[PDB]
Coordinates of C-alpha atoms and ligand atoms in Angstrom, one line a residue:
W18 CA 0.0 0.0 0.0
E19 CA 2.5 2.7 -1.2
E20 CA 0.6 3.5 -4.4
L21 CA 3.6 2.5 -6.5
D22 CA 1.3 1.0 -9.1
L23 CA -0.9 4.1 -9.5
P24 CA -0.2 6.0 -12.7
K25 CA 2.4 8.8 -12.4
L26 CA 1.3 12.3 -13.1
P27 CA 1.7 13.0 -16.8
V28 CA 3.9 15.8 -18.3
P29 CA 1.9 17.7 -21.0
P30 CA 3.5 18.6 -24.4
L31 CA 5.1 22.0 -24.3
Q32 CA 3.5 23.6 -27.3
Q33 CA 0.0 22.5 -26.1
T34 CA 0.5 24.1 -22.7
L35 CA 1.8 27.3 -24.2
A36 CA -1.0 27.4 -26.7
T37 CA -3.7 26.9 -24.1
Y38 CA -2.0 29.6 -21.9
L39 CA -2.3 32.3 -24.6
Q40 CA -5.9 31.3 -25.5
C41 CA -6.9 31.5 -21.8
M42 CA -5.4 35.0 -21.3
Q43 CA -6.2 36.9 -24.6
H44 CA -9.6 38.1 -23.4
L45 CA -8.3 39.0 -20.0
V46 CA -5.5 41.5 -20.7
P47 CA -5.1 44.6 -22.8
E48 CA -4.5 44.1 -26.6
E49 CA -1.1 45.8 -26.5
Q50 CA 0.1 43.7 -23.6
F51 CA -1.1 40.5 -25.2
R52 CA 0.9 41.1 -28.4
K53 CA 4.1 41.3 -26.3
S54 CA 3.3 38.1 -24.5
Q55 CA 2.8 36.3 -27.8
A56 CA 6.4 37.3 -28.7
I57 CA 7.6 36.4 -25.2
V58 CA 6.0 33.0 -25.5
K59 CA 7.2 32.4 -29.0
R60 CA 10.8 33.1 -27.9
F61 CA 10.3 30.9 -24.8
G62 CA 8.9 28.0 -27.0
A63 CA 11.2 28.3 -30.0
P64 CA 13.3 25.2 -31.2
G65 CA 16.3 24.8 -28.9
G66 CA 15.0 27.6 -26.6
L67 CA 14.6 27.9 -22.8
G68 CA 11.2 26.1 -22.8
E69 CA 12.5 22.9 -24.4
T70 CA 15.6 22.8 -22.2
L71 CA 13.4 23.0 -19.1
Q72 CA 10.9 20.5 -20.5
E73 CA 13.7 18.0 -20.8
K74 CA 14.6 18.6 -17.2
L75 CA 11.0 18.1 -16.2
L76 CA 10.8 14.7 -17.9
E77 CA 14.0 13.7 -16.0
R78 CA 12.3 14.8 -12.8
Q79 CA 9.2 12.7 -13.6
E80 CA 11.3 9.6 -13.8
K81 CA 13.1 10.2 -10.5
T82 CA 10.1 11.2 -8.4
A83 CA 6.7 9.7 -7.6
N84 CA 5.0 13.0 -8.5
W85 CA 7.0 15.8 -10.1
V86 CA 4.9 18.6 -8.7
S87 CA 4.4 17.6 -5.0
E88 CA 7.2 19.6 -3.5
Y89 CA 6.6 22.6 -5.9
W90 CA 2.9 22.7 -5.4
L91 CA 3.0 22.2 -1.6
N92 CA 5.4 25.2 -1.2
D93 CA 3.7 27.5 -3.7
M94 CA 0.2 26.9 -2.6
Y95 CA 0.7 26.8 1.2
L96 CA 4.1 26.7 2.9
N97 CA 5.4 29.9 1.3
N98 CA 2.3 31.9 2.0
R99 CA 3.1 34.5 4.7
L100 CA -0.5 35.4 5.4
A101 CA -2.1 34.4 8.8
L102 CA -3.8 31.0 8.5
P103 CA -7.2 32.2 9.8
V104 CA -9.6 33.1 7.0
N105 CA -6.8 33.3 4.4
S106 CA -5.9 29.6 4.3
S107 CA -7.7 27.5 6.9
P108 CA -11.2 26.5 5.8
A109 CA -13.9 25.5 8.2
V110 CA -16.8 22.9 8.1
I111 CA -19.9 23.9 10.1
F112 CA -22.2 21.2 11.6
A113 CA -25.9 21.6 12.3
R114 CA -26.8 23.8 15.2
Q115 CA -26.7 21.5 18.3
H116 CA -29.2 21.7 21.2
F117 CA -27.4 21.9 24.6
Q118 CA -29.6 22.7 27.7
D119 CA -26.6 22.7 29.9
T120 CA -22.8 22.1 30.1
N121 CA -23.2 18.4 30.5
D122 CA -24.9 18.0 27.1
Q123 CA -22.0 19.9 25.5
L124 CA -19.5 17.7 27.2
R125 CA -21.3 14.5 26.2
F126 CA -21.2 15.6 22.6
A127 CA -17.5 16.3 22.9
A128 CA -16.9 13.0 24.6
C129 CA -18.9 11.1 21.9
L130 CA -16.9 13.0 19.2
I131 CA -13.5 12.2 20.7
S132 CA -14.5 8.5 21.0
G133 CA -15.5 8.6 17.3
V134 CA -12.1 10.0 16.4
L135 CA -10.2 7.2 18.2
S136 CA -12.4 4.6 16.4
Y137 CA -11.8 6.2 13.0
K138 CA -8.0 6.5 13.8
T139 CA -8.1 2.8 14.6
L140 CA -9.4 2.0 11.1
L141 CA -6.6 4.0 9.6
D142 CA -3.7 2.7 11.7
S143 CA -4.6 -0.9 10.6
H144 CA -5.3 0.0 7.0
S145 CA -8.9 -1.1 7.1
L146 CA -10.4 2.0 5.5
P147 CA -11.8 1.1 2.1
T148 CA -10.0 2.5 -1.0
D149 CA -11.9 5.3 -2.8
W150 CA -12.9 4.4 -6.3
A151 CA -13.5 6.8 -9.3
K152 CA -16.5 6.0 -11.4
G153 CA -15.8 5.8 -15.1
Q154 CA -17.6 5.3 -18.4
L155 CA -15.9 1.9 -19.2
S156 CA -14.5 1.2 -15.8
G157 CA -13.4 2.7 -12.5
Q158 CA -10.0 3.0 -10.8
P159 CA -8.5 3.4 -7.3
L160 CA -7.7 6.8 -6.0
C161 CA -4.7 7.9 -3.9
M162 CA -5.3 7.5 -0.1
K163 CA -2.2 9.3 1.2
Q164 CA -4.2 12.3 2.5
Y165 CA -6.2 10.2 5.0
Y166 CA -3.0 9.1 6.8
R167 CA -2.0 12.7 7.4
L168 CA -5.3 13.7 9.1
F169 CA -4.2 13.2 12.7
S170 CA -0.4 13.0 12.3
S171 CA 0.4 16.4 10.8
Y172 CA 1.7 19.7 12.2
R173 CA 2.6 22.9 10.4
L174 CA 5.7 24.5 11.8
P175 CA 6.2 28.2 11.0
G176 CA 9.5 29.3 9.4
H177 CA 11.0 32.8 8.9
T178 CA 10.6 32.5 5.1
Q179 CA 9.1 29.0 4.6
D180 CA 6.9 26.8 6.8
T181 CA 7.4 23.0 7.3
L182 CA 4.8 20.2 7.2
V183 CA 5.9 17.7 9.9
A184 CA 4.8 14.1 9.7
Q185 CA 4.6 12.9 13.3
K186 CA 7.7 10.8 14.0
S187 CA 5.8 7.8 15.3
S188 CA 9.1 5.9 15.7
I189 CA 8.6 6.1 19.5
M190 CA 7.4 2.8 21.0
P191 CA 3.8 2.7 22.3
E192 CA 3.2 5.7 24.6
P193 CA 0.3 7.8 25.9
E194 CA -1.6 9.1 22.9
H195 CA -3.5 12.2 23.6
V196 CA -5.7 15.1 22.5
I197 CA -5.4 18.7 23.5
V198 CA -8.5 20.4 25.0
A199 CA -8.8 24.1 24.7
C200 CA -11.0 25.9 27.3
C201 CA -11.0 29.5 28.4
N202 CA -7.8 29.8 26.2
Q203 CA -6.2 27.2 28.5
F204 CA -4.7 24.0 27.1
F205 CA -4.9 20.6 28.7
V206 CA -3.4 17.2 27.9
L207 CA -6.1 14.5 27.8
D208 CA -4.6 11.0 27.6
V209 CA -6.8 8.7 25.5
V210 CA -4.9 5.5 26.6
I211 CA -3.9 4.2 30.0
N212 CA -2.2 0.8 30.2
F213 CA -3.4 -1.4 27.3
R214 CA -6.8 0.4 27.7
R215 CA -8.6 3.0 25.6
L216 CA -10.8 5.4 27.7
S217 CA -14.5 4.9 27.4
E218 CA -17.0 7.6 26.4
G219 CA -17.9 7.8 30.1
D220 CA -14.3 8.3 31.2
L221 CA -13.8 11.1 28.6
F222 CA -16.9 12.7 30.0
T223 CA -15.5 12.5 33.5
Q224 CA -12.1 13.9 32.3
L225 CA -13.7 16.8 30.4
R226 CA -15.7 17.8 33.5
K227 CA -12.4 18.2 35.5
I228 CA -11.0 20.3 32.6
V229 CA -13.9 22.7 32.6
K230 CA -13.6 23.0 36.3
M231 CA -9.9 23.8 36.3
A232 CA -10.1 26.1 33.3
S233 CA -13.0 28.1 34.9
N234 CA -10.8 29.0 37.8
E235 CA -9.6 32.6 37.3
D236 CA -7.0 32.2 40.0
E237 CA -4.5 30.4 37.9
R238 CA -5.2 31.5 34.3
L239 CA -2.2 31.5 32.0
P240 CA -1.6 33.9 29.0
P241 CA -3.6 33.1 25.8
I242 CA -0.6 31.7 23.9
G243 CA -2.8 30.2 21.2
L244 CA -3.3 33.8 19.9
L245 CA 0.2 33.7 18.5
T246 CA -0.7 30.9 16.1
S247 CA -3.2 33.3 14.5
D248 CA -0.6 35.8 13.3
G249 CA 1.4 36.1 10.1
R250 CA 3.6 33.1 9.6
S251 CA 6.8 35.1 9.9
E252 CA 5.6 36.9 13.0
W253 CA 4.7 33.5 14.6
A254 CA 8.0 32.0 13.7
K255 CA 9.8 34.9 15.5
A256 CA 7.5 34.7 18.6
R257 CA 7.8 30.9 18.7
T258 CA 11.6 31.1 18.6
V259 CA 11.4 33.4 21.7
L260 CA 9.3 30.7 23.4
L261 CA 11.9 28.0 22.7
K262 CA 14.3 29.8 25.1
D263 CA 12.6 28.2 28.1
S264 CA 12.4 24.5 28.9
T265 CA 8.8 24.8 30.1
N266 CA 7.5 26.2 26.8
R267 CA 9.6 23.6 24.9
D268 CA 7.7 20.8 26.7
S269 CA 4.3 22.4 26.1
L270 CA 4.9 22.9 22.4
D271 CA 6.1 19.3 22.0
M272 CA 2.8 18.0 23.6
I273 CA 0.7 20.1 21.2
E274 CA 2.9 19.0 18.3
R275 CA 2.3 15.4 19.0
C276 CA -1.4 15.3 19.7
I277 CA -4.1 13.6 17.6
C278 CA -6.1 16.8 17.3
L279 CA -7.6 19.7 19.2
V280 CA -11.0 19.9 20.8
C281 CA -12.1 23.5 21.6
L282 CA -14.8 24.0 24.2
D283 CA -15.8 27.6 23.1
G284 CA -17.8 29.9 25.4
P285 CA -21.4 31.1 24.5
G286 CA -21.8 33.8 21.8
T287 CA -24.4 36.5 21.3
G288 CA -27.0 37.1 18.6
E289 CA -29.0 34.7 16.4
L290 CA -27.2 31.4 15.7
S291 CA -27.7 31.5 11.9
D292 CA -25.5 29.6 9.5
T293 CA -23.5 32.8 8.9
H294 CA -23.0 33.5 12.6
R295 CA -21.8 30.0 13.3
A296 CA -19.5 30.1 10.3
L297 CA -17.8 33.3 11.6
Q298 CA -17.0 31.7 14.9
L299 CA -15.4 28.6 13.2
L300 CA -13.4 30.8 10.9
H301 CA -11.8 33.2 13.5
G302 CA -13.6 32.7 16.8
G303 CA -14.7 36.3 16.8
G304 CA -11.4 37.6 18.0
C305 CA -9.4 37.3 21.2
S306 CA -12.2 38.8 23.3
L307 CA -14.5 35.9 22.4
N308 CA -13.1 32.6 21.2
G309 CA -10.2 33.7 18.9
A310 CA -7.5 32.7 21.4
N311 CA -9.1 29.3 22.2
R312 CA -7.3 27.9 19.2
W313 CA -4.0 26.5 17.8
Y314 CA -3.9 26.9 14.0
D315 CA -0.7 24.9 13.4
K316 CA -2.6 21.7 14.2
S317 CA -4.4 20.0 11.3
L318 CA -7.9 19.4 12.9
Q319 CA -9.5 21.6 15.5
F320 CA -13.0 20.4 16.5
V321 CA -15.1 23.1 18.0
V322 CA -17.9 22.2 20.5
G323 CA -19.4 25.4 21.8
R324 CA -21.6 25.8 24.8
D325 CA -24.5 27.3 22.8
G326 CA -24.4 24.6 20.2
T327 CA -22.1 26.0 17.6
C328 CA -20.0 23.0 16.4
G329 CA -17.7 22.2 13.5
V330 CA -14.1 21.8 12.4
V331 CA -11.4 24.3 11.3
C332 CA -8.5 22.7 9.5
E333 CA -5.1 23.5 8.2
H334 CA -5.2 23.0 4.4
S335 CA -1.6 22.0 3.7
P336 CA -1.9 18.2 4.4
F337 CA -5.2 17.4 2.7
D338 CA -8.1 18.8 0.7
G339 CA -11.8 19.3 1.4
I340 CA -13.0 16.0 -0.2
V341 CA -11.1 13.8 2.2
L342 CA -11.9 16.1 5.1
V343 CA -15.6 15.8 4.4
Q344 CA -15.4 12.0 4.2
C345 CA -13.7 11.8 7.6
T346 CA -16.2 14.2 9.2
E347 CA -19.2 12.4 7.8
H348 CA -18.0 9.0 9.0
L349 CA -17.5 10.6 12.4
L350 CA -20.9 12.3 12.6
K351 CA -22.8 9.2 11.4
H352 CA -21.1 7.1 14.1
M353 CA -22.2 9.5 16.8
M354 CA -25.7 8.2 16.3
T355 CA -25.1 4.6 15.4
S356 CA -26.8 1.6 16.9
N357 CA -26.8 1.3 20.7
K358 CA -29.4 -0.4 22.8
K359 CA -26.6 -2.7 24.4
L360 CA -25.6 -2.6 28.0
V361 CA -23.1 0.2 28.5
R362 CA -20.5 0.0 25.7
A363 CA -18.3 1.9 28.2
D364 CA -15.6 0.6 30.5
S365 CA -15.7 3.1 33.4
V366 CA -12.4 2.2 35.2
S367 CA -11.0 3.1 38.6
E368 CA -9.8 6.7 39.2
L369 CA -7.9 8.2 36.3
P370 CA -5.2 10.8 36.7
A371 CA -6.4 14.4 36.3
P372 CA -5.8 15.9 32.8
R373 CA -2.7 18.1 33.0
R374 CA -2.6 21.8 32.2
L375 CA 0.2 23.0 29.9
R376 CA 2.5 25.7 31.4
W377 CA 4.1 28.7 29.8
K378 CA 7.1 30.9 30.6
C379 CA 6.0 34.4 29.6
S380 CA 8.6 37.2 29.1
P381 CA 8.4 40.9 28.2
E382 CA 9.1 40.0 24.5
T383 CA 6.2 37.4 24.5
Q384 CA 3.9 40.0 26.1
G385 CA 4.7 42.3 23.2
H386 CA 3.9 39.7 20.7
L387 CA 0.6 38.9 22.3
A388 CA -0.6 42.5 22.1
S389 CA 0.5 42.7 18.4
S390 CA -1.3 39.4 17.5
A391 CA -4.5 40.6 19.3
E392 CA -4.7 43.7 17.2
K393 CA -3.8 41.8 14.0
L394 CA -6.6 39.2 14.6
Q395 CA -9.2 42.0 15.1
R396 CA -8.3 43.4 11.7
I397 CA -9.1 40.0 10.2
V398 CA -12.4 39.8 12.1
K399 CA -13.5 43.3 11.0
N400 CA -12.3 42.8 7.4
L401 CA -14.2 39.6 6.7
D402 CA -17.4 40.1 4.7
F403 CA -19.1 36.7 4.7
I404 CA -22.5 35.2 3.9
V405 CA -24.1 31.7 3.6
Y406 CA -26.5 32.1 0.7
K407 CA -29.1 29.4 0.2
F408 CA -30.5 29.2 -3.3
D409 CA -33.7 27.2 -3.0
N410 CA -35.3 27.7 -6.4
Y411 CA -33.8 24.4 -7.7
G412 CA -30.7 22.2 -7.8
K413 CA -29.1 19.0 -9.3
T414 CA -32.3 17.3 -10.5
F415 CA -33.2 20.3 -12.7
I416 CA -29.7 20.8 -14.1
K417 CA -29.4 17.0 -14.7
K418 CA -32.7 16.9 -16.7
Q419 CA -31.2 19.6 -19.0
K420 CA -28.4 17.1 -19.6
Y421 CA -25.8 19.4 -18.2
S422 CA -23.1 18.9 -15.5
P423 CA -24.1 20.5 -12.1
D424 CA -20.5 21.7 -11.5
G425 CA -20.0 23.2 -15.0
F426 CA -23.5 24.8 -14.8
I427 CA -22.7 26.4 -11.6
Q428 CA -19.3 27.6 -12.8
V429 CA -20.9 29.2 -15.9
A430 CA -23.4 30.9 -13.6
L431 CA -20.5 32.3 -11.4
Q432 CA -19.0 33.8 -14.5
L433 CA -22.3 35.4 -15.3
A434 CA -22.7 36.8 -11.8
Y435 CA -19.3 38.4 -12.0
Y436 CA -19.8 39.8 -15.5
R437 CA -23.2 41.5 -14.8
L438 CA -21.4 43.3 -11.9
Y439 CA -18.1 44.3 -13.4
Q440 CA -18.6 43.9 -17.1
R441 CA -15.5 41.8 -17.6
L442 CA -14.3 38.3 -16.5
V443 CA -11.2 37.7 -14.4
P444 CA -8.8 34.8 -13.8
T445 CA -10.7 32.2 -11.9
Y446 CA -9.7 29.2 -9.9
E447 CA -11.6 26.0 -9.5
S448 CA -10.0 23.1 -7.6
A449 CA -9.8 19.9 -9.6
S450 CA -8.7 16.6 -8.0
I451 CA -5.8 14.6 -9.6
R452 CA -5.9 11.8 -7.1
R453 CA -6.0 9.3 -9.9
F454 CA -2.2 9.7 -9.9
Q455 CA 0.5 9.0 -7.3
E456 CA 0.4 11.6 -4.4
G457 CA -2.1 13.5 -6.4
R458 CA -3.6 16.6 -4.9
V459 CA -5.2 19.2 -7.3
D460 CA -4.8 21.3 -10.5
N461 CA -6.8 24.2 -11.7
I462 CA -9.8 24.5 -14.1
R463 CA -9.9 28.0 -15.6
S464 CA -13.7 28.7 -15.9
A465 CA -13.2 32.2 -17.4
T466 CA -13.1 30.8 -20.9
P467 CA -13.6 32.5 -24.3
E468 CA -16.8 30.6 -24.7
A469 CA -18.1 31.7 -21.3
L470 CA -17.2 35.3 -22.2
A471 CA -19.4 35.0 -25.3
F472 CA -22.3 33.6 -23.3
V473 CA -22.2 36.3 -20.6
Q474 CA -22.1 39.1 -23.1
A475 CA -25.1 37.8 -25.0
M476 CA -27.0 37.4 -21.6
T477 CA -26.5 41.0 -20.3
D478 CA -25.2 43.2 -23.2
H479 CA -28.0 42.4 -25.6
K480 CA -31.0 44.1 -24.0
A481 CA -33.4 42.2 -26.3
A482 CA -30.8 42.3 -29.0
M483 CA -30.9 38.6 -29.8
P484 CA -33.2 35.5 -29.8
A485 CA -33.3 32.9 -27.0
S486 CA -32.3 30.5 -29.8
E487 CA -28.8 31.9 -30.0
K488 CA -28.3 32.5 -26.2
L489 CA -29.4 28.8 -25.7
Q490 CA -26.7 27.8 -28.2
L491 CA -23.9 29.9 -26.7
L492 CA -24.7 28.3 -23.4
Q493 CA -24.2 24.9 -25.0
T494 CA -20.7 25.7 -26.3
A495 CA -19.9 27.3 -22.9
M496 CA -20.9 24.1 -21.1
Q497 CA -19.0 22.0 -23.6
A498 CA -15.9 24.1 -22.8
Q499 CA -16.2 23.6 -19.0
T500 CA -16.6 19.9 -19.4
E501 CA -13.6 19.8 -21.7
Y502 CA -11.3 21.8 -19.4
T503 CA -12.6 19.7 -16.5
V504 CA -11.6 16.4 -18.2
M505 CA -8.3 18.0 -19.2
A506 CA -7.5 18.9 -15.6
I507 CA -8.5 15.8 -13.8
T508 CA -6.4 13.7 -16.3
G509 CA -3.3 15.8 -15.7
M510 CA -3.3 17.8 -18.9
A511 CA -4.2 21.2 -17.6
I512 CA -1.6 24.0 -17.5
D513 CA -1.1 25.4 -14.0
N514 CA 1.0 22.6 -12.5
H515 CA 3.1 22.3 -15.7
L516 CA 3.9 26.0 -15.8
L517 CA 4.6 26.0 -12.1
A518 CA 7.3 23.3 -12.6
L519 CA 9.0 25.0 -15.6
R520 CA 9.1 28.2 -13.5
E521 CA 10.7 26.5 -10.5
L522 CA 13.2 24.5 -12.6
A523 CA 14.2 27.8 -14.1
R524 CA 14.7 29.4 -10.7
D525 CA 17.0 26.6 -9.8
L526 CA 19.0 26.7 -13.1
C527 CA 18.8 30.2 -14.5
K528 CA 21.0 33.0 -13.0
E529 CA 18.3 35.5 -14.0
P530 CA 14.5 35.1 -13.9
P531 CA 13.1 34.2 -17.3
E532 CA 11.3 36.8 -19.4
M533 CA 8.4 34.3 -19.6
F534 CA 7.7 34.4 -15.8
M535 CA 8.3 38.1 -15.2
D536 CA 5.7 38.9 -17.9
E537 CA 2.8 40.9 -16.3
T538 CA 0.5 38.6 -18.3
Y539 CA 1.8 35.6 -16.3
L540 CA 1.6 37.3 -12.9
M541 CA -2.0 38.4 -13.6
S542 CA -3.0 34.8 -14.7
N543 CA -2.1 33.7 -11.1
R544 CA -4.1 36.4 -9.2
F545 CA -7.4 34.6 -8.7
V546 CA -10.0 37.3 -8.0
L547 CA -12.6 34.5 -8.2
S548 CA -11.5 31.4 -6.1
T549 CA -13.9 28.5 -6.0
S550 CA -14.5 24.9 -5.2
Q551 CA -17.4 22.4 -4.9
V552 CA -17.6 20.5 -1.6
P553 CA -20.7 18.2 -1.7
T554 CA -22.0 16.6 1.4
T555 CA -24.6 14.0 2.2
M556 CA -25.8 15.7 5.4
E557 CA -26.4 19.0 7.3
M558 CA -23.0 20.7 7.0
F559 CA -21.0 23.0 4.8
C560 CA -17.5 24.1 4.1
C561 CA -16.3 27.7 3.7
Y562 CA -13.1 29.8 3.3
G563 CA -11.8 33.3 2.5
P564 CA -10.5 35.0 -0.7
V565 CA -6.9 34.5 -1.8
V566 CA -6.3 38.1 -3.0
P567 CA -7.3 41.5 -1.5
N568 CA -9.7 42.4 -4.2
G569 CA -11.1 38.9 -4.5
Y570 CA -13.9 36.5 -3.7
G571 CA -14.0 33.0 -2.2
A572 CA -16.9 30.9 -3.3
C573 CA -17.6 27.4 -1.9
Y574 CA -20.8 25.7 -3.0
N575 CA -22.7 22.5 -2.0
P576 CA -25.1 21.2 -4.7
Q577 CA -28.2 19.5 -3.4
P578 CA -31.0 17.8 -5.4
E579 CA -33.5 20.7 -4.9
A580 CA -31.1 23.5 -3.7
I581 CA -27.6 24.9 -3.7
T582 CA -25.7 26.4 -0.7
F583 CA -23.2 29.1 -1.5
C584 CA -20.6 30.3 1.0
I585 CA -19.2 33.7 -0.2
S586 CA -16.4 35.8 1.2
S587 CA -14.6 39.0 0.4
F588 CA -12.8 41.8 2.1
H589 CA -14.4 45.0 3.4
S590 CA -11.2 46.9 2.8
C591 CA -11.8 46.5 -1.0
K592 CA -14.5 49.0 -2.1
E593 CA -15.1 47.1 -5.4
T594 CA -16.2 43.9 -3.7
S595 CA -19.3 43.0 -1.7
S596 CA -20.3 39.5 -0.6
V597 CA -24.0 40.2 -0.5
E598 CA -24.2 41.8 -3.9
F599 CA -22.2 38.9 -5.5
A600 CA -24.5 36.3 -3.9
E601 CA -27.6 38.0 -5.2
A602 CA -26.0 38.2 -8.6
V603 CA -25.3 34.5 -8.5
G604 CA -29.0 33.9 -7.6
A605 CA -30.2 36.2 -10.4
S606 CA -27.9 34.3 -12.8
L607 CA -29.3 30.9 -11.9
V608 CA -32.9 32.2 -12.4
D609 CA -32.0 33.8 -15.8
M610 CA -30.3 30.5 -16.8
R611 CA -33.4 28.4 -15.9
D612 CA -35.7 30.7 -17.9
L613 CA -33.3 30.3 -20.8
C614 CA -33.5 26.5 -20.7
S615 CA -37.3 26.6 -20.3
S616 CA -37.4 28.5 -23.6
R617 CA -36.4 25.4 -25.5
Ligands
NA701 NA1 -15.6 44.8 0.1

């Protein structure tokens, strides 16, 4: 089970990648600028030029590695990003609002959840989790499962210029496995194993009760160290290095760096507990004066079990993508109601030892860093413009009856929504899984196609100028284009990863940065004003995340049979963006598109 037999990620032909690149950008940049890029690309791709030299090096790389883009992609997409993890990088999954009449109901839920995680982790450790299969026209095929084995064994260490993804060095003989429980910004070690025994749901309940009792005590409250994990990666690397000066912090950091996951017992919030309100809390906790410090962003999974019923999971994106995260969470949720009745179962034981509180040595430097982080987090809280928009007019069954793909249909709509608001399309990003190949993560589908441009123009720039007969046909060619790019991407023939490798190979072999990658056209192509992804679920929950550029949007959608849930974000600091206006534009676009299909 090392996936050595899975197909290796393909390396696309050079001329095809360059040709698709120019075609994708033409309608997105000024005529004058485009003409220069054509010359730049021609020089780059000429016989015996830089491009062919690099391509030859890339093929060499493909033979020597399991996946030629892994290292490059992991650094470019996550580890090199200097922005704070909250909102900018770490996505959150929000569960249904829970009903807790008192603390004990909240703790039983948490206890049941932890128990489910130990069971799920048991299936993994013994390789009993069934292999995911991809449905195909003539057959199916196994998908890479590497992401699952990083769910509970990963930690993201901050670095001054580049972060590090650490794979828990489980080379240490059997020892006390544990989870970290965050309460009132205090962190506690909760051992899940004592002797050859695994704690029962009842025991966990008993242990959590002691934690809530000790954390509630104001007499011995420690500083909210978790706040430091919410800052810029370079700031946190500096603050963390200051912490390492004392043996006490060194021990506490180690415990956190070797836990299975975090369980955050958040305090009650104010206001109506609407989908939007609950999302805001999972995304950033509401700042350090609410739940923003009751966190530790370097850890992959942080389960949140709030007193008022707000529950969910915030996760660090570098080790795995949303599809795998959702499969894990669904398996966990379903088993919390199993089945148972018876008786118881549981166991418881004794008498078990009390859960231990992690200590910290706080100096004047650290105190300075805490105040900086606090202000920094508030800016993020105030800057996030977010909304959970539920489109209930229709969903998958309607789109399917029109013989169109629900994903492509929704992507075309998003292009229409953007056009009717800005009268132009922009470089768009849509996550596409390449798990068919060894260590496969994702590549990009560029939905802002020439065909989509033609469709949106006829839909809003006509004003009764043309028949529904034509509009209906332009939509067809646009849908065909989406489907085509989608198949190109999931089969490893897209352009993003290919260009990324050529660029990095050039950085490592060329004394001076190539004209090809300094070209404004190229830089613009990688500024995704519209960042999107589909995260479908079979139950009451949804995933959400922030924009990847200051003047951008983040759009995550969940397609249901009779409805579609849209999670939209943007920054208040950018006057030209508004999450509510864009959501309503998406709605309008879906209604306009249905009326068009009805006119057939
Ligand atoms: Na804005």
